[PDB]
Amino acid sequence: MQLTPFLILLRKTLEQLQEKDTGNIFSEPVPLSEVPDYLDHIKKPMDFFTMKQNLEAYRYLNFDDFEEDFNLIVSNCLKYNAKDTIFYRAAVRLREQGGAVLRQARRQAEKM
């Protein structure tokens, strides 16, 4: 496949995913000022802005690795936060809704 169409597809998929983050709690790195003990539990932080940066740095050359970092956004949040928190439920919703976005984008990818 050709790189340029693939990357415009990842750009579109990334904005579709970011759209699901209505609370805007995944679109920027978790502020270590608000959450000082965060990197004590979270080995690799991830967020949609970082993903965009990674995309443009050509770090995503297949959907698996793109999807890998999205999954980090979700799993980091499930790991750090108690089940009874808004944050945890947000991550579950993102897993669900983002999963559907990803399945479709992958389908368009398979077409390529």
CB-based contact 88:77 (threshold 8 Å): yes
Instruction: Name the site residues for ligand 4YO (rule: CB under 6 A).
Output: 25, 30-31, 34-35, 77, 80-81, 87
Q: Is 73 helix (H, G, I), strand (E, B) or coil?
A: helix
Q: By C-beta, is 40 or 64 nearer to ligand 4YO?
A: 40
| In the complex, least distance from residue 2 CB atom to ligand 4YO, rounded to whole angstroms | 35
DSSP codes joined into one string, 30-66: --TTT-TTHHHH-SS---HHHHHHHHHTT---SHHHH
| In the complex, least distance from residue 72 CB atom to ligand 4YO, rounded to whole angstroms | 11
Q: By C-beta, is 36 or 110 nearer to ligand 4YO?
A: 36
CA separation for the pair 75, 21 (Å, rounded):
15
Q: By C-beta, is 34 or 110 nearer to ligand 4YO?
A: 34
| In the complex, least distance from residue 106 CB atom to ligand 4YO, rounded to whole angstroms | 25
